[PDB]
Design a protein around this ligand. Structure first.
Ligand SMILES: Nc1ncnc2c1ncn2[C@@H]1O[C@H](CSCC[C@H](N)C(=O)O)[C@@H](O)[C@H]1O
Ligand SMILES: Nc1ncnc2c1ncn2[C@@H]1O[C@H](CSCC[C@H](N)C(=O)O)[C@@H](O)[C@H]1O
Lengths: 211, 211
Protein backbone atom coordinates (compact mmCIF):
# COMPACT_ATOMS: atom_id res chain seq x y z
CA UNK A 1 0.00 0.00 0.00
CA UNK A 2 1.80 3.11 -1.40
CA UNK A 3 -0.57 5.38 0.51
CA UNK A 4 0.12 3.68 3.82
CA UNK A 5 2.13 6.67 5.08
CA UNK A 6 0.54 9.50 3.07
CA UNK A 7 -2.95 9.64 4.60
CA UNK A 8 -2.41 12.27 7.28
CA UNK A 9 -0.83 14.98 5.13
CA UNK A 10 -2.45 13.93 1.85
CA UNK A 11 -4.36 17.23 1.64
CA UNK A 12 -1.62 19.50 2.99
CA UNK A 13 -0.67 20.62 -0.48
CA UNK A 14 -4.21 21.94 -1.10
CA UNK A 15 -3.43 24.56 1.51
CA UNK A 16 -0.58 26.06 -0.51
CA UNK A 17 -1.24 28.78 -3.12
CA UNK A 18 -0.57 26.59 -6.13
CA UNK A 19 -2.25 23.55 -4.61
CA UNK A 20 -5.26 25.63 -3.61
CA UNK A 21 -5.52 26.78 -7.21
CA UNK A 22 -5.19 23.29 -8.62
CA UNK A 23 -7.77 21.72 -6.33
CA UNK A 24 -10.13 24.63 -6.97
CA UNK A 25 -9.92 24.20 -10.72
CA UNK A 26 -10.36 20.45 -10.52
CA UNK A 27 -13.48 20.69 -8.37
CA UNK A 28 -14.94 23.28 -10.75
CA UNK A 29 -14.32 20.96 -13.68
CA UNK A 30 -15.79 18.01 -11.78
CA UNK A 31 -18.90 20.00 -10.89
CA UNK A 32 -19.36 20.61 -14.59
CA UNK A 33 -19.80 16.88 -15.19
CA UNK A 34 -21.74 15.87 -12.07
CA UNK A 35 -25.23 14.73 -13.09
CA UNK A 36 -28.47 14.68 -11.05
CA UNK A 37 -28.84 11.65 -8.83
CA UNK A 38 -29.62 10.15 -5.47
CA UNK A 39 -26.85 7.66 -4.78
CA UNK A 40 -23.14 8.15 -5.39
CA UNK A 41 -20.33 5.66 -5.05
CA UNK A 42 -16.70 6.75 -5.10
CA UNK A 43 -14.21 3.95 -5.72
CA UNK A 44 -10.90 4.86 -4.09
CA UNK A 45 -12.47 7.60 -1.96
CA UNK A 46 -9.17 7.95 -0.08
CA UNK A 47 -9.38 10.71 2.52
CA UNK A 48 -12.92 11.44 1.36
CA UNK A 49 -12.08 14.84 -0.13
CA UNK A 50 -14.83 14.57 -2.72
CA UNK A 51 -17.28 12.66 -0.56
CA UNK A 52 -17.62 15.57 1.84
CA UNK A 53 -17.85 18.15 -0.95
CA UNK A 54 -20.38 16.43 -3.23
CA UNK A 55 -24.13 17.19 -2.67
CA UNK A 56 -25.64 13.74 -3.30
CA UNK A 57 -27.97 12.62 -0.46
CA UNK A 58 -26.71 9.03 -0.57
CA UNK A 59 -22.92 8.71 -0.51
CA UNK A 60 -20.78 5.57 -0.32
CA UNK A 61 -16.99 5.34 -0.31
CA UNK A 62 -14.95 2.26 -1.20
CA UNK A 63 -11.35 2.47 -0.01
CA UNK A 64 -8.93 -0.47 0.40
CA UNK A 65 -6.15 1.42 2.19
CA UNK A 66 -6.64 1.13 5.94
CA UNK A 67 -4.56 4.29 6.33
CA UNK A 68 -6.60 6.36 3.87
CA UNK A 69 -9.86 4.89 5.16
CA UNK A 70 -8.99 5.86 8.73
CA UNK A 71 -8.83 9.50 7.65
CA UNK A 72 -11.64 9.41 5.10
CA UNK A 73 -14.40 8.19 7.39
CA UNK A 74 -13.31 10.76 9.95
CA UNK A 75 -13.56 13.61 7.43
CA UNK A 76 -16.65 12.39 5.55
CA UNK A 77 -18.72 10.68 8.31
CA UNK A 78 -22.03 11.36 6.56
CA UNK A 79 -21.07 8.69 4.04
CA UNK A 80 -20.96 4.92 4.41
CA UNK A 81 -17.35 3.73 4.27
CA UNK A 82 -16.63 0.27 2.86
CA UNK A 83 -13.24 -1.48 2.90
CA UNK A 84 -13.00 -3.16 -0.50
CA UNK A 85 -11.20 -3.14 -3.85
CA UNK A 86 -12.47 -1.66 -7.09
CA UNK A 87 -12.00 -5.06 -8.73
CA UNK A 88 -14.70 -6.56 -6.47
CA UNK A 89 -17.41 -4.17 -5.28
CA UNK A 90 -19.63 -5.75 -2.55
CA UNK A 91 -22.85 -4.33 -4.00
CA UNK A 92 -25.61 -5.91 -6.08
CA UNK A 93 -25.99 -4.78 -9.67
CA UNK A 94 -27.72 -1.53 -10.63
CA UNK A 95 -27.55 0.07 -7.19
CA UNK A 96 -26.02 3.51 -7.87
CA UNK A 97 -26.95 6.53 -10.00
CA UNK A 98 -23.38 7.81 -10.20
CA UNK A 99 -19.99 6.14 -9.73
CA UNK A 100 -16.90 8.34 -9.37
CA UNK A 101 -13.29 7.38 -10.06
CA UNK A 102 -10.97 10.31 -9.39
CA UNK A 103 -7.28 9.58 -10.08
CA UNK A 104 -7.80 6.04 -8.85
CA UNK A 105 -7.27 4.06 -12.05
CA UNK A 106 -3.64 5.20 -11.77
CA UNK A 107 -3.30 2.88 -8.78
CA UNK A 108 -5.76 -0.02 -9.16
CA UNK A 109 -4.46 -3.50 -9.94
CA UNK A 110 -6.76 -4.14 -12.89
CA UNK A 111 -8.23 -1.20 -14.78
CA UNK A 112 -10.60 -3.04 -17.08
CA UNK A 113 -11.93 -5.07 -14.17
CA UNK A 114 -12.49 -1.96 -12.03
CA UNK A 115 -14.38 -0.36 -14.92
CA UNK A 116 -16.53 -3.46 -15.32
CA UNK A 117 -17.38 -3.43 -11.64
CA UNK A 118 -18.22 0.27 -11.90
CA UNK A 119 -20.70 -0.39 -14.71
CA UNK A 120 -22.31 -3.46 -13.08
CA UNK A 121 -22.97 -1.61 -9.84
CA UNK A 122 -24.23 1.29 -11.93
CA UNK A 123 -27.95 1.21 -12.63
CA UNK A 124 -29.56 1.55 -16.12
CA UNK A 125 -28.20 4.64 -17.86
CA UNK A 126 -26.10 5.30 -14.79
CA UNK A 127 -23.38 7.92 -14.92
CA UNK A 128 -19.75 6.85 -14.64
CA UNK A 129 -17.43 9.82 -14.08
CA UNK A 130 -13.70 9.17 -14.46
CA UNK A 131 -10.88 11.56 -13.70
CA UNK A 132 -7.21 10.94 -14.51
CA UNK A 133 -3.92 12.84 -14.55
CA UNK A 134 -3.57 13.12 -18.34
CA UNK A 135 -0.34 11.29 -19.14
CA UNK A 136 0.66 14.01 -21.61
CA UNK A 137 0.71 16.96 -19.23
CA UNK A 138 3.88 18.45 -17.68
CA UNK A 139 2.49 17.25 -14.33
CA UNK A 140 2.73 13.68 -15.55
CA UNK A 141 6.32 14.49 -16.46
CA UNK A 142 6.93 15.57 -12.87
CA UNK A 143 5.17 12.59 -11.32
CA UNK A 144 6.84 10.10 -13.64
CA UNK A 145 10.21 11.54 -12.60
CA UNK A 146 9.30 11.56 -8.91
CA UNK A 147 8.13 7.98 -9.32
CA UNK A 148 11.36 6.59 -10.76
CA UNK A 149 13.08 8.71 -8.15
CA UNK A 150 11.29 6.40 -5.71
CA UNK A 151 8.76 8.89 -4.31
CA UNK A 152 5.43 7.45 -3.17
CA UNK A 153 2.86 6.83 -4.41
CA UNK A 154 4.19 7.81 -7.81
CA UNK A 155 6.65 4.92 -8.02
CA UNK A 156 3.64 2.61 -8.29
CA UNK A 157 1.41 4.71 -10.53
CA UNK A 158 0.44 4.09 -14.16
CA UNK A 159 -0.40 7.06 -16.36
CA UNK A 160 -3.40 7.31 -18.64
CA UNK A 161 -4.31 9.63 -21.48
CA UNK A 162 -7.88 10.51 -22.43
CA UNK A 163 -7.19 8.32 -25.46
CA UNK A 164 -6.84 5.26 -23.22
CA UNK A 165 -10.15 5.90 -21.48
CA UNK A 166 -12.03 6.44 -24.73
CA UNK A 167 -10.31 3.27 -25.88
CA UNK A 168 -11.82 1.44 -22.90
CA UNK A 169 -15.21 3.07 -22.39
CA UNK A 170 -15.84 4.41 -25.86
CA UNK A 171 -16.93 8.04 -26.57
CA UNK A 172 -17.85 9.98 -23.39
CA UNK A 173 -21.21 11.75 -23.20
CA UNK A 174 -19.38 14.78 -21.80
CA UNK A 175 -15.85 15.87 -20.95
CA UNK A 176 -14.02 18.27 -18.69
CA UNK A 177 -10.43 19.34 -18.11
CA UNK A 178 -8.50 21.48 -15.68
CA UNK A 179 -5.11 22.97 -14.86
CA UNK A 180 -3.19 23.94 -17.99
CA UNK A 181 -0.41 25.75 -16.16
CA UNK A 182 2.72 23.77 -15.25
CA UNK A 183 4.06 22.59 -11.85
CA UNK A 184 6.55 25.46 -11.69
CA UNK A 185 4.08 28.16 -12.65
CA UNK A 186 4.28 31.58 -11.03
CA UNK A 187 1.27 33.66 -9.88
CA UNK A 188 -1.08 35.28 -10.73
CA UNK A 189 -2.01 31.68 -11.52
CA UNK A 190 -4.89 32.54 -13.84
CA UNK A 191 -2.45 34.13 -16.30
CA UNK A 192 -0.15 31.11 -16.09
CA UNK A 193 -3.18 28.90 -16.62
CA UNK A 194 -4.49 30.67 -19.73
CA UNK A 195 -0.88 30.73 -20.98
CA UNK A 196 -0.52 27.00 -20.52
CA UNK A 197 -3.62 26.50 -22.64
CA UNK A 198 -2.26 28.64 -25.48
CA UNK A 199 1.09 26.86 -25.26
CA UNK A 200 -0.74 23.66 -26.13
CA UNK A 201 -0.36 21.92 -22.77
CA UNK A 202 -2.56 18.88 -22.18
CA UNK A 203 -4.47 19.57 -18.97
CA UNK A 204 -3.34 18.06 -15.68
CA UNK A 205 -6.83 16.62 -15.20
CA UNK A 206 -9.07 15.03 -17.78
CA UNK A 207 -12.68 14.15 -16.87
CA UNK A 208 -15.14 12.00 -18.79
CA UNK A 209 -18.75 10.93 -18.14
CA UNK A 210 -20.13 7.68 -19.58
CA UNK A 211 -23.65 6.24 -19.48
CA UNK B 1 20.36 -0.46 -31.59
CA UNK B 2 17.13 1.55 -31.09
CA UNK B 3 17.89 3.81 -34.07
CA UNK B 4 18.50 0.75 -36.27
CA UNK B 5 15.64 1.79 -38.55
CA UNK B 6 15.14 5.49 -37.85
CA UNK B 7 18.16 6.91 -39.67
CA UNK B 8 16.36 7.63 -42.94
CA UNK B 9 13.23 9.31 -41.57
CA UNK B 10 15.02 10.72 -38.52
CA UNK B 11 15.07 14.28 -39.87
CA UNK B 12 11.60 14.05 -41.46
CA UNK B 13 9.69 15.79 -38.68
CA UNK B 14 11.91 18.87 -39.06
CA UNK B 15 9.95 19.34 -42.28
CA UNK B 16 6.59 19.97 -40.59
CA UNK B 17 5.66 23.50 -39.42
CA UNK B 18 6.13 22.84 -35.70
CA UNK B 19 9.16 20.66 -36.33
CA UNK B 20 10.64 23.43 -38.45
CA UNK B 21 10.02 25.91 -35.63
CA UNK B 22 11.37 23.65 -32.90
CA UNK B 23 14.60 22.63 -34.63
CA UNK B 24 15.28 26.23 -35.64
CA UNK B 25 14.82 27.33 -32.05
CA UNK B 26 17.19 24.62 -30.87
CA UNK B 27 19.80 25.63 -33.44
CA UNK B 28 19.62 29.21 -32.27
CA UNK B 29 20.09 28.25 -28.62
CA UNK B 30 22.94 25.85 -29.47
CA UNK B 31 24.86 28.33 -31.60
CA UNK B 32 24.43 30.95 -28.90
CA UNK B 33 26.30 28.69 -26.48
CA UNK B 34 29.05 27.38 -28.79
CA UNK B 35 32.47 28.89 -27.87
CA UNK B 36 35.52 29.91 -29.95
CA UNK B 37 37.74 27.06 -31.13
CA UNK B 38 39.30 25.04 -33.94
CA UNK B 39 38.32 21.46 -33.16
CA UNK B 40 34.95 19.91 -32.32
CA UNK B 41 33.96 16.39 -31.33
CA UNK B 42 30.31 15.34 -31.33
CA UNK B 43 29.59 12.15 -29.40
CA UNK B 44 26.52 10.45 -30.80
CA UNK B 45 26.63 12.66 -33.91
CA UNK B 46 23.87 10.56 -35.50
CA UNK B 47 22.92 11.87 -38.94
CA UNK B 48 25.37 14.77 -38.71
CA UNK B 49 22.61 17.36 -38.44
CA UNK B 50 24.76 19.55 -36.19
CA UNK B 51 28.15 18.66 -37.68
CA UNK B 52 26.90 19.86 -41.06
CA UNK B 53 25.99 23.19 -39.45
CA UNK B 54 28.83 24.19 -37.10
CA UNK B 55 31.66 26.76 -37.79
CA UNK B 56 34.51 24.64 -36.40
CA UNK B 57 37.20 24.05 -39.09
CA UNK B 58 38.11 20.63 -37.75
CA UNK B 59 35.26 18.41 -36.60
CA UNK B 60 34.90 14.75 -35.70
CA UNK B 61 31.76 12.70 -35.24
CA UNK B 62 31.61 9.64 -32.99
CA UNK B 63 28.61 7.40 -33.69
CA UNK B 64 28.19 3.73 -32.64
CA UNK B 65 25.11 3.10 -34.77
CA UNK B 66 26.11 1.92 -38.23
CA UNK B 67 22.59 2.74 -39.42
CA UNK B 68 22.82 6.37 -38.26
CA UNK B 69 26.50 6.55 -39.24
CA UNK B 70 25.72 5.54 -42.82
CA UNK B 71 23.53 8.64 -43.09
CA UNK B 72 25.78 10.95 -41.09
CA UNK B 73 29.01 10.34 -43.00
CA UNK B 74 26.90 11.13 -46.04
CA UNK B 75 25.13 14.31 -44.89
CA UNK B 76 28.25 15.67 -43.20
CA UNK B 77 31.22 14.47 -45.31
CA UNK B 78 33.46 17.37 -44.31
CA UNK B 79 33.90 15.71 -40.93
CA UNK B 80 35.77 12.60 -39.83
CA UNK B 81 33.33 9.87 -38.84
CA UNK B 82 34.52 7.45 -36.17
CA UNK B 83 32.57 4.33 -35.26
CA UNK B 84 32.91 4.05 -31.47
CA UNK B 85 31.04 4.54 -28.19
CA UNK B 86 31.15 7.56 -25.92
CA UNK B 87 32.26 5.25 -23.12
CA UNK B 88 35.55 4.68 -24.94
CA UNK B 89 36.70 7.47 -27.24
CA UNK B 90 39.59 6.35 -29.51
CA UNK B 91 41.42 9.65 -29.03
CA UNK B 92 44.33 10.77 -26.88
CA UNK B 93 43.63 13.22 -24.07
CA UNK B 94 43.48 16.97 -24.63
CA UNK B 95 42.66 16.83 -28.32
CA UNK B 96 39.48 18.87 -28.80
CA UNK B 97 38.51 22.46 -28.03
CA UNK B 98 34.84 21.60 -27.85
CA UNK B 99 32.95 18.38 -27.19
CA UNK B 100 29.24 18.22 -27.96
CA UNK B 101 26.61 15.90 -26.48
CA UNK B 102 23.19 16.72 -27.87
CA UNK B 103 20.36 14.47 -26.67
CA UNK B 104 22.88 11.63 -26.51
CA UNK B 105 23.19 11.07 -22.75
CA UNK B 106 19.62 9.77 -22.73
CA UNK B 107 20.78 6.81 -24.84
CA UNK B 108 24.30 5.96 -23.68
CA UNK B 109 25.16 2.97 -21.47
CA UNK B 110 27.11 4.72 -18.73
CA UNK B 111 26.48 8.46 -18.40
CA UNK B 112 29.25 9.12 -15.89
CA UNK B 113 31.86 7.36 -18.01
CA UNK B 114 30.74 9.15 -21.16
CA UNK B 115 31.20 12.48 -19.35
CA UNK B 116 34.60 11.40 -18.01
CA UNK B 117 35.71 10.55 -21.55
CA UNK B 118 34.39 13.85 -22.86
CA UNK B 119 36.42 15.71 -20.26
CA UNK B 120 39.51 13.60 -20.89
CA UNK B 121 39.71 14.36 -24.62
CA UNK B 122 39.10 18.03 -23.95
CA UNK B 123 42.12 20.35 -24.32
CA UNK B 124 43.09 22.69 -21.47
CA UNK B 125 40.53 25.50 -21.43
CA UNK B 126 38.18 23.33 -23.44
CA UNK B 127 34.41 23.47 -23.19
CA UNK B 128 31.85 20.70 -22.86
CA UNK B 129 28.39 21.47 -24.24
CA UNK B 130 25.50 19.25 -23.28
CA UNK B 131 21.94 19.39 -24.52
CA UNK B 132 19.19 17.18 -23.10
CA UNK B 133 15.44 16.86 -23.43
CA UNK B 134 14.65 18.36 -20.02
CA UNK B 135 12.82 15.61 -18.15
CA UNK B 136 10.29 17.97 -16.61
CA UNK B 137 8.99 19.37 -19.90
CA UNK B 138 5.73 18.32 -21.58
CA UNK B 139 7.84 16.76 -24.35
CA UNK B 140 9.37 14.41 -21.80
CA UNK B 141 5.83 13.37 -20.93
CA UNK B 142 5.18 12.57 -24.57
CA UNK B 143 8.33 10.54 -25.09
CA UNK B 144 8.03 8.60 -21.85
CA UNK B 145 4.55 7.62 -23.01
CA UNK B 146 5.71 6.78 -26.51
CA UNK B 147 8.51 4.75 -24.95
CA UNK B 148 5.95 2.93 -22.82
CA UNK B 149 3.87 2.14 -25.88
CA UNK B 150 6.94 0.61 -27.48
CA UNK B 151 7.88 3.35 -29.98
CA UNK B 152 11.64 3.48 -30.66
CA UNK B 153 14.03 4.82 -29.57
CA UNK B 154 12.13 6.22 -26.59
CA UNK B 155 11.62 2.76 -25.09
CA UNK B 156 15.36 2.79 -24.33
CA UNK B 157 15.67 6.39 -23.17
CA UNK B 158 16.48 7.79 -19.74
CA UNK B 159 15.57 11.44 -19.06
CA UNK B 160 17.62 14.13 -17.38
CA UNK B 161 16.79 17.40 -15.70
CA UNK B 162 19.25 20.26 -15.58
CA UNK B 163 19.67 19.34 -11.91
CA UNK B 164 20.97 15.92 -12.89
CA UNK B 165 23.62 17.55 -15.07
CA UNK B 166 24.59 19.96 -12.32
CA UNK B 167 25.08 17.01 -9.99
CA UNK B 168 27.31 15.33 -12.57
CA UNK B 169 29.34 18.26 -13.88
CA UNK B 170 28.83 20.92 -11.24
CA UNK B 171 27.47 24.43 -11.95
CA UNK B 172 27.76 25.20 -15.68
CA UNK B 173 29.61 28.28 -16.93
CA UNK B 174 26.70 29.26 -19.15
CA UNK B 175 23.27 27.91 -20.09
CA UNK B 176 20.78 27.81 -22.93
CA UNK B 177 17.08 26.91 -23.27
CA UNK B 178 14.64 26.33 -26.10
CA UNK B 179 11.07 25.36 -26.95
CA UNK B 180 8.67 26.19 -24.13
CA UNK B 181 5.62 25.36 -26.23
CA UNK B 182 4.05 21.94 -25.87
CA UNK B 183 3.96 19.13 -28.45
CA UNK B 184 0.40 20.17 -29.29
CA UNK B 185 0.94 23.88 -29.69
CA UNK B 186 -0.96 25.70 -32.42
CA UNK B 187 0.48 28.42 -34.69
CA UNK B 188 1.54 31.22 -34.53
CA UNK B 189 4.28 29.28 -32.76
CA UNK B 190 6.22 32.20 -31.32
CA UNK B 191 3.13 33.08 -29.22
CA UNK B 192 2.72 29.47 -28.15
CA UNK B 193 6.36 29.53 -27.04
CA UNK B 194 6.02 32.72 -25.00
CA UNK B 195 2.88 31.19 -23.50
CA UNK B 196 4.68 28.04 -22.42
CA UNK B 197 7.32 30.11 -20.69
CA UNK B 198 4.65 32.05 -18.77
CA UNK B 199 2.81 28.78 -18.08
CA UNK B 200 5.82 27.71 -16.05
CA UNK B 201 6.75 25.04 -18.60
CA UNK B 202 10.26 23.65 -18.53
CA UNK B 203 12.09 23.93 -21.89
CA UNK B 204 12.09 20.94 -24.24
CA UNK B 205 15.84 21.52 -24.61
CA UNK B 206 18.22 22.46 -21.83
CA UNK B 207 21.80 23.47 -22.70
CA UNK B 208 24.80 23.82 -20.43
CA UNK B 209 28.45 24.64 -20.99
CA UNK B 210 31.15 23.43 -18.60
CA UNK B 211 34.90 23.95 -18.55
N1 LIG C 1 -7.38 -1.65 -6.50
C1 LIG C 1 -7.96 -0.54 -5.91
N2 LIG C 1 -9.30 -0.47 -5.77
C2 LIG C 1 -9.89 0.60 -5.21
N3 LIG C 1 -9.17 1.64 -4.77
C3 LIG C 1 -7.82 1.65 -4.87
C4 LIG C 1 -7.16 0.54 -5.46
N4 LIG C 1 -5.84 0.80 -5.43
C5 LIG C 1 -5.64 1.96 -4.89
N5 LIG C 1 -6.83 2.53 -4.52
C6 LIG C 1 -7.04 3.84 -3.87
O1 LIG C 1 -7.08 4.90 -4.87
C7 LIG C 1 -6.76 6.14 -4.19
C8 LIG C 1 -5.94 7.02 -5.16
S1 LIG C 1 -5.66 8.68 -4.48
C9 LIG C 1 -7.22 9.51 -4.94
C10 LIG C 1 -8.19 9.51 -3.73
C11 LIG C 1 -9.50 10.29 -4.02
N6 LIG C 1 -10.17 9.75 -5.22
C12 LIG C 1 -9.21 11.76 -4.22
O2 LIG C 1 -8.99 12.24 -5.45
O3 LIG C 1 -9.18 12.50 -3.26
C13 LIG C 1 -5.94 5.78 -2.94
O4 LIG C 1 -6.60 6.24 -1.75
C14 LIG C 1 -5.83 4.24 -3.01
O5 LIG C 1 -5.81 3.62 -1.73
N1 LIG D 1 26.96 4.66 -25.83
C1 LIG D 1 26.87 5.60 -26.84
N2 LIG D 1 27.94 6.34 -27.18
C2 LIG D 1 27.88 7.26 -28.16
N3 LIG D 1 26.76 7.48 -28.84
C3 LIG D 1 25.64 6.79 -28.58
C4 LIG D 1 25.64 5.80 -27.55
N4 LIG D 1 24.40 5.27 -27.50
C5 LIG D 1 23.65 5.84 -28.39
N5 LIG D 1 24.37 6.79 -29.09
C6 LIG D 1 23.89 7.66 -30.20
O1 LIG D 1 23.32 8.91 -29.68
C7 LIG D 1 22.44 9.43 -30.71
C8 LIG D 1 21.22 10.09 -30.03
S1 LIG D 1 20.11 10.86 -31.26
C9 LIG D 1 20.90 12.48 -31.44
C10 LIG D 1 21.81 12.50 -32.69
C11 LIG D 1 22.41 13.90 -32.94
N6 LIG D 1 23.22 14.33 -31.79
C12 LIG D 1 21.30 14.92 -33.20
O2 LIG D 1 20.73 15.58 -32.16
O3 LIG D 1 20.94 15.15 -34.33
C13 LIG D 1 22.00 8.23 -31.58
O4 LIG D 1 22.38 8.43 -32.95
C14 LIG D 1 22.70 7.01 -30.95
O5 LIG D 1 23.10 6.03 -31.91
Amino acid sequence: DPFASLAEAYEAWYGTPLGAYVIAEEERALKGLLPPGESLLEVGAGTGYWLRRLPYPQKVGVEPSEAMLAVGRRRAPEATWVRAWGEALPFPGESFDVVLLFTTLEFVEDVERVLLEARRVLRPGGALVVGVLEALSPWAALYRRLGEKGVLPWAQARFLAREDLKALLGPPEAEGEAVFLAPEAHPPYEEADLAGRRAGNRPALYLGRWR
